[PDB]
């Protein structure tokens, strides 16, 4: 009967996260994943998923 | 700065209002875009005035533009970038020269005959 | 021209005899001295350089204004020069000591216009905010700012 | 050179604007299909 | 400075701003943090939606789609009065305050009317430069009345207009120029029969150049 | 500066961490390039980013090597580059005479592939056969937990030990 539910901290971080300013510069993408400490792609990892997991990650801090 | 042959070039003051005018005639369909248009507008004699960009690299493309407006009696200005200027004219592709033409009581009257002043006072 | 070099041309030949170089921007202003041996070329690059007929070097290339030097105006006697800039200061500088006299500040725009009165103390500079201000080499104040146009 | 992008009202540097609004208006959906 | 991006991302950015909302309302409704949106029926959708039901107590059911009715117009009115705030803070303090950005450089323009006498005219014409925030001077002399107003660039171009084309003996702009700094204060006015208490006046802040152009003007015209 | 890779090794299902591994592009620059498209594939095969990920350690002596890397058969017989098939050693400079360093897997001269070979000891013999890739500059614990993975017959370990995620670091 508890909560056990942080599912609506996933839909809140996510509409955060939907307003947060990325750089549209891949330059800029990895410049700030380097300040943080992030790898500048994944094995098959395009651009705008680049994009996409910068916004992610930038979510949290 | 990076043309030299750039005689009416404009500052970063008016060049503001010159994009709200270009934005307001866009507005009221009361503008033609690109070189061939400018020209064809000043050889109908309807065109009031032409503001070209001096990024384009040939830029004697562009330069019978001022001869024609002196031929025509017309002012004629030029801007530091030909990206804004498309943006302001309302398509995304750079354009390196635009008029503006006539309307019948037009609300835009006053703005271009004051932006027809100041660049005329502008040439030396 | 604007291509910062100075054409000497004669009365008779249809080319220009002598071809003095040395500037890059557009040369806003060139005038030959009341005596003829030097000549004072003020250029759009906040210069205001001095060659010579028997020599053609660099005399005084006499800067100061934060903006480019539009017109220069020498006097009849050819003591003093006034150089008027586009950042509405206009420097009398001296031509037997090599400094500034007067200021000539007291305008908005330009000073397009500027030539020394033969009366040897008024100078009157019209500049492009549709006024033109008068001013005294003795007094060393502005006598009178006429709405010329 | 630097514009302000009229998307996020940031400097935005003036040599990229072009591509900065053919990519920073990229349709979200676009990216599944 | 920015740039005006065109017509065509217009659209794509607010068709952007609308399916992301409508996205977001929709996870959040299949969270269920809102009820699911019941249908908006209206008078025409009275029998398609509820009539079965609205067979046994119609009156009820219509007293409660006109109270969904009178909801969304309340939603609409709430919003735009809750928007509504230009409606008077900008009136005159935020959307006709402007001053004509006269900070650097005071447009001045120096107009000659032959004639004058209506205090209409110059009631009118010193109302005209109150609400614009411009300032003026104003000295009447035989048939020669001098009016210098330095205003911002803006109100310059409303008044130039106005003597010259709203107002009737004729008026000419005998100097249009600007200046570093303002010289003349509020709009008042002064008779001056004489051109020396016109010109001493005049020398005050002075503007004894206006006065003497304009005399010089109106000896030029009894010429020819 | 030299390129860093990243691989996270899964062992078992269970994932022993990423190890850290920067390939020498000075000594080796074909070997580099090759290496990228192993951390991300591009268009591979038909616009597929085919490389080094999801492959496996298919041979795994104790503390002597462990080879695999081979995304085409998958038991150490696959052979792929960048180079449109096996491609020919850079240089013998570097030697395999530290633990840790990842050389070029291959069964001879000029057919050097996929196949990475991390070099689990001092192995002399090895030096002047394979050029060595890269060194691992972190992760050396998952590489020595790899290596002592049982190992059946063949040197062909009874655990799946595969890479789980594999990138530019």
């Known amino acids: 009967s508890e909560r056990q539910a942080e599912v609506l901290a996933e839909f809140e971080r996510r509409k955060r996260a939907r307003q947060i300013n990325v750089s549209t510069d891949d330059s800029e993408v990895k410049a700030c994943l380097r300040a943080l400490g992030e790898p500048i792609t994944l094995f098959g990892e395009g651009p705008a998923e680049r994009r996409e997991r910068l916004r992610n990650i930038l979510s949290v801090v | 700065d990076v043309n030299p042959k750039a005689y009416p070039l404009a500052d970063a003051h008016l060049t503001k209002k010159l994009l709200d005018l270009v934005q307001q005639s866009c507005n009221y369909k009361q503008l033609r875009k690109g070189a061939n248009e400018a020209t064809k507008t000043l050889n109908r004699g309807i065109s009031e005035f032409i503001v070209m960009a001096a990024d384009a690299e040939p830029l004697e493309i562009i330069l019978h533009l001022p001869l024609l407006c002196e031929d025509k009696n017309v002012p004629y200005v030029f801007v530091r970038s030909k990206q804004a200027l498309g943006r302001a004219c309302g398509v995304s592709r750079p354009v390196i020269a635009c008029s503006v033409t006539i309307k019948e009581g037009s609300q835009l009257k006053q703005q271009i005959q004051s932006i027809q002043q100041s660049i005329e006072r502008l040439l030396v | 021209a604007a ?32 005596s003829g041996r030097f000549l004072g070329t003020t250029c759009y690059d906040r210069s205001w350089r001095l060659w010579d007929l028997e020599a053609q070097e660099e005399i005084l290339h006499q800067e100061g204004h934060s ?16 150089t ?11 031509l037997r000591t090599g400094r500034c006299i007067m200021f000539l500040e007291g305008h908005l725009k330009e000073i397009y216009g500027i030539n020394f009165s033969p009366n040897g103390y008024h100078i009157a500079t019209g500049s492009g905010d549709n006024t033109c201000k008068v001013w005294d080499l003795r007094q060393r104040r502005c006598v009178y700012t006429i709405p010329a146009h | 050179e630097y514009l302000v992008s009229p998307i996020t009202g940031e400097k935005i540097p003036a040599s990229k604007m072009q591509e900065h609004m053919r990519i920073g208006l990229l349709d979200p959906r676009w990216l599944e299909q | 400075l920015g740039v005006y991006l065109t017509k065509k991302e217009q659209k794509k950015l607010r068709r952007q701003t609308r399916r992301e909302a409508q996205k977001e309302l929709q996870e959040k409704v299949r969270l269920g943090l809102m009820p699911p949106p019941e249908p908006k029926v209206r008078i025409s959708n009275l029998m398609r939606v509820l009539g079965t039901e609205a067979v046994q107590d119609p009156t009820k059911v ?20 809750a928007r509504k705030l230009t409606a008077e803070q900008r009136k005159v303090k935020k959307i006709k305050k402007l001053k004509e950005d006269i900070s650097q450089g005071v447009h001045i323009s120096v107009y000659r009317v032959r004639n004058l006498s209506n205090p209409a005219k110059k009631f009118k014409i010193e109302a005209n430069a109150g609400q614009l925030y411009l300032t003026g001077v104003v000295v009447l002399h035989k048939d020669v009345n001098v009016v210098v107003v330095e205003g911002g660039p803006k109100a310059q171009k409303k008044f130039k207009r106005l003597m010259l084309h709203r107002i009737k003996n004729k008026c000419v702009l005998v100097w249009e120029g600007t200046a570093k700094d303002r010289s003349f204060g509020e709009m008042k006015f002064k008779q001056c029969p004489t051109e020396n208490m016109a010109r001493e006046h005049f020398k005050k802040h002075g503007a004894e150049h206006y006065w003497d ?8 015209e009894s010429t020819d | 500066v030299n390129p860093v890779v990243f691989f996270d090794v899964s062992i078992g299902g269970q994932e022993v961490g990423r190890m850290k591994i920067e390939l020498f592009a000075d000594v080796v620059p074909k070997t580099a390039e090759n290496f990228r498209q192993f951390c991300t594939g591009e268009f591979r095969k038909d616009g597929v980013p085919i490389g080094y990920k999801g492959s496996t350690f298919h041979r795994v002596i104790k503390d002597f090597m462990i080879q695999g890397g081979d995304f085409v058969n998958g038991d150490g017989t696959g052979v792929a580059s960048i180079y449109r098939g096996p491609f020919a050693d850079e240089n013998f400079k570097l030697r395999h005479s530290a633990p840790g ?18 070099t689990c000891s001092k192995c002399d013999w090895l030096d002047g056969k394979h050029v060595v890739f890269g060194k691992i500059i972190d992760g050396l614990l998952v590489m020595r937990k790899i290596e002592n993975v049982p190992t059946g017959p063949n040197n062909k370990p009874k655990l799946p030990v595969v890479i789980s995620q594999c990138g530019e670091m």
């Open chain 3, 67 to 82: 903006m480019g030097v539009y017109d220069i105006a020498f006097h009849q006697d050819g003591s003093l020069a006034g």
């Open chain 3, 84 to 94: 008027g800039g586009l950042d509405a200061f206009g420097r009398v500088w001296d």
């Open chain 6, 101 to 118: 360093l990842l050389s070029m897997a291959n069964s001879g001269p000029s057919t050097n592939g996929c196949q990475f070979f991390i």
């Open chain 3, 3 to 34: 291509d910062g070099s100075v054409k000497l041309w004669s009365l008779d030949s249809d080319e220009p005899v002598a071809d003095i170089e040395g500037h890059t921007v557009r040369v806003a202003r060139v005038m030959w001295h009341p």
């Open chain 5, 62 to 81: 219509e007293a409660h789609v006109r109270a969904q009715m009178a909801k969304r117009q309340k939603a609409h009115e709430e919003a735009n009065a």
């Open chain 5, 213 to 220: 152009l304009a005399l010089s003007e109106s000896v030029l």
